[PDB]
From a paper:
Overall, MAR consists of seven transmembrane helices, A to G, connected through short intracellular and extracellular loops.
Arf1L8K,Q71L is located at least 7 Å from the predicted hydrophobic-hydrophilic boundary of a crystalline layer and forms only minor contacts with the AB and EF loops of MAR and the cytoplasmic part of helix G. This suggests that the MAR-Arf1L8K,Q71L chimera could be used to study late photocycle intermediates of MAR that are inhibited by crystal contacts in the orange-form crystals.
Author numbering: 2 to 55, 62 to 396
Write the structure that this text describes.
Amino acid sequence: EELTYRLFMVATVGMLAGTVFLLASSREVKPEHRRGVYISALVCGIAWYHYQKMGSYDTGLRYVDWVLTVPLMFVEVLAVTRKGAAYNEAVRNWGIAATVMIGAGYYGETSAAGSNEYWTGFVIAMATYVWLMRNLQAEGEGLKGDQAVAFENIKNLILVGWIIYPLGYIAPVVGDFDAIREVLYTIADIINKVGLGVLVLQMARVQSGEGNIFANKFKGLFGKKEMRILMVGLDAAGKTTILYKLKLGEIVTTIPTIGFNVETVEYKNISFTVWDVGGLDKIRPLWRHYFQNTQGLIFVVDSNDRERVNEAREELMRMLAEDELRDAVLLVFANKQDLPNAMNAAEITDKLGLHSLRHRNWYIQATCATSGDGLYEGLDWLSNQLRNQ
Ligand SMILES: Nc1nc2c(ncn2[C@@H]2O[C@H](COP(=O)(O)OP(=O)(O)O)[C@@H](O)[C@H]2O)c(=O)[nH]1
Ligand SMILES: *C/C=C(C)/C=C/C=C(C)/C=C/C1=C(C)CCCC1(C)C
């Protein structure tokens, strides 16, 4: 009896420790994948509040915790492998299945052990349990690389760790084991809830990493609407390197006239057009054929090139004078931050005179095109300005 109360005290402290850790590390994940770890911290917080409360024992106290957390634990798993309509369909179906599973378990546990109502709730709960575990096994078939390995660990934890619950359910009918049921339930809750949140965190950590061999890092940013983006800058600013790093498609290089090189990348309804500004004066008039309906203007500048930083400003200001780009949102990539002589973002802002720009929605991001750092942050801002406005 005293061991059952000691585990309730350990569970309360354990759930709270996993709550703050899951919250403290949530800032490292990109905002696209932070929803999973937020739910993960919410599961431990709900378990902490209910284990603080834990005639006789209160079965309803634990089943109230299960009926809320189990669907949420499926939400943070489905938020990893699905998105959009497929995510909402699975959350509804799995949440309903978990609700019937937990509800049937409460119907049977609140009856006489070994009675027909006890086994009926066991039969219904096991059927939905097998259904949930079969759908979980079939999840993540499209994942590859580190995400597939990370999701395999999430699957294995639930597929193995949740077996303790039906075993603990049948303990009262295989022996004088009323106390070991709460022991099995409590230890399983600590292992599964704290464990899944850690595994959900490591998953979202992978989805936010710089490795992009499978080309998934920058696709969940721009959405489905039309978005014409012009990315210009001086030669050797890093524009082609950024195009490759986006992993949004093969670069299409054209030469419409001798001395004018154009690079395009198309994905969904999103397009990047790239050329070098400056150069010969006879080339500048040809840029006007590409300005119409441009929604985003990305200006790349070599932060390590201090001799040409003043010409970079002159080209940007000439571009911002074009009437066809009066509504274009400006995003400035302070590229090559990894180089030792690289000017910081505030210095590039001062050298380019961005604070003098009126009626212009702009933003500057320090970036390293070789490693990709900063590219997601700048594009997430640009995508947010163009989608929400
Ligand atoms: N160290 C460093 N080098 C970069 C970075 N971005 C581009 N480069 C280098 O700059 C050189 C030319 O860049 P490029 O993409 O061709 O610039 P573009 O002419 O505007 O397309 C390449 O050799 C890149 O390796 C960066 O962020 N850091
Ligand atoms: C955070 C709490 C967790 C993950 C609880 C999970 C509960 C289940 C997997 C247990 C379901 C049951 C059966 C499969 C059979 C007997 C009745 C239940 C409810 C114990």
